[PDB]
Symmetry: C2
Subunit: 353 residues, 2 copies
């Protein structure tokens, strides 16, 4: 199965350097400064055209049966060609820069600082993005006396998803490829998380961060994302709680007062800041970092995870999106309640009921 070097380069290229059977990015050590042999090339069919060769991580390659020359015992032509097909569409996408403007604000933050659609368009132009059309502007409904109960949240989600479906009824979206979303939000954490749930983890989303009111640019596109410092939780019988100290440092006293006996796991960065989202790459870092720790925490108990978060709007959306794929686990979201002396108060339940 060993094959010449130019063949290696073609296979790495056409597969975009990921293991076809499990999406592991095989350049992860280059992304920290090391060479290119973290991957194994296999033929697809049992018993020269590079289109007949798969790129695998050694972990998956070991799990495959193989003959004396290295060929597989079972045919996987379907998976390979499917994978390559997926790549082909992504790479060849026409109007790769068009995205749908999506602005979502809560009655309170629109009255103080309404984001007009034009301003999002401005930030898009500054990145080289262009607009499908007038776009979507949604205002989260003010909760009635029923508060933000289960019915309220469902109505919120539907309103978003309604507007999303309407763009697919313009033909281009319905089939072929679902359009990209230039999304920005200006509400409390629970609401924005719900917006994240609506668009979903697998959507082509381009999140924006209007943390500085009339700044319509990423602060520093060169900036490297911060390290996300994880503090695993202590043992005990208490309810498991997740603290996100990114916009600020969350006082442990405030957590336990709202959630007695909380076993606090914490994710933080060295210098918490409201403006820590220096460029979009930070968000991807957040996701990758968080996506890991969530898997670890879910393993320690099936009981709900209580979330106390101090994160910028943009991350609140992304966090909501991650949990879409993690629909096996129950999370309870706490946010500062102005009506209860700014104490953390449970407003939202995500995942299973």
């Amino acid at each position: 199965f060993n094959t010449n070097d130019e063949t290696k380069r073609i296979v790495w290229t056409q597969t975009a350097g990921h293991c076809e059977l499990c999406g592991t990015d095989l350049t992860f050590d280059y992304r920290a400064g090391k060479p290119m042999k973290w991957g194994e090339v296999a033929h697809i069919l049992p018993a020269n055209d590079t289109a007949n060769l798969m790129l695998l991580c050694p972990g998956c390659h070991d799990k495959i049966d193989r003959d004396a020359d290295g060929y597989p015992e079972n045919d996987l032509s379907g998976l390979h060609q499917a994978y390559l097909e997926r790549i082909r569409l992504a790479a060849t996408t026409p109007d790769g820069g068009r995205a749908i403007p999506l602005i979502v604000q809560s009655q309170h933050f629109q009255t103080i600082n309404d984001i007009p659609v034009r301003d999002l368009l401005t930030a898009m132009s500054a990145e080289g993005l262009t607009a499908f059309d007038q776009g979507i502007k949604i205002a989260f409904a003010a909760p009635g006396p029923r508060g933000r109960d289960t019915t309220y949240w469902q109505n919120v989600k539907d309103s978003v998803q309604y507007e999303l479906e309407q763009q697919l009824k313009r033909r281009g979206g319905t089939y072929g490829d679902s359009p990209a979303l230039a999304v920005v939000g200006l509400a409390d954490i629970p609401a924005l998380m719900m917006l994240g749930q609506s668009i979903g983890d697998r959507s082509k989303r381009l999140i924006f961060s209007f943390h500085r009111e009339h700044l319509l640019r990423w602060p520093d596109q060169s900036a490297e994302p911060p390290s996300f410092l994880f503090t695993p939780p202590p043992n005990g019988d208490g309810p498991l709680a997740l603290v996100l100290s990114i916009s600020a440092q969350v006082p442990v006293r405030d957590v336990t007062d709202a959630l007695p006996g909380a076993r606090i796991a914490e994710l933080s960065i060295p210098e918490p800041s409201y403006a820590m989202v220096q460029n979009r790459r930070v968000i991807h870092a957040f996701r990758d970092a968080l996506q890991i720790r969530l898997s670890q925490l879910e393993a320690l108990t099936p009981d709900p995870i209580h979330v106390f978060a101090a994160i910028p709007a943009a991350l609140a959306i992304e966090f909501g999106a991650l949990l879409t794929t993690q629909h096996q686990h129950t999370y309870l979201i706490f946010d500062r309640d102005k009506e209860n002396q700014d104490r953390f108060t449970q407003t939202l339940q995500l995942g299973p009921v």
Copy 2:
């Protein structure tokens, strides 16, 4: 120099993370692998304007055509920021690469009501062929029969309802499992009708669908004749010069009699695409189909350059390619194609049956 200079290992990484396509116009830059290739027809650009890189994720891959069309400083950096496209592009790749259960597909069988209960494709056999390729079923699977035409015949409304009917069924498969904004399943599609119908099926699924076409053979059902067989070469014969009607002939299943074309189309300027030995069984494996695509996609672009007038198509091709052919023509939105097929009640003479595009 104007070009942003970079070392050899970093280039290899950029080509990889972008899968070797131009980020601004989707041109596949690996096309010289048809002959032989230095990594020379792809030019690397930085995205964010400079400030007084070991992060290579901010480096774009461009074709020379797009690279020239960007303003630039003496060092090779752009004057305007393009981070949005790049990040968008790479995310699109990542999504494709990270798709969970990448092998799930919608079984889709499409047959003519017309005839041959002898050649009835059951869902069960397609599922077998799918499992044999490492694919698994997304849902129960769809089996469609093109509606029998009324007295109006197979007019455009019939053709439109055909397109709508297929496209409808597909929308419902994603709407039962939700996630419209995400990973759309693949189509394990197979068809058993006349060429115009199968082409229309291809039009329905569209170029932008993740299609894995299967081929029905009486002796082998839906399993491939020979996964090891190498695809044939496709021999192109450019058309003669003139203003007469332009005609494209596809002689793969058989050799199309040149006179039968002229009888249906006076003065036809015949371009012809063929293989060395046209054969009924040339669809030995899916790569044959992909080869067909790659080859034909080029010549279509060339032919469109030779005229603003329609291209007339006379095809003798297996079922599977009739589908693929129909899907490709989705991308050529700027051109009109007229499809001719044998008319049995007219002594098998070619008759214009289908109009594709404006």
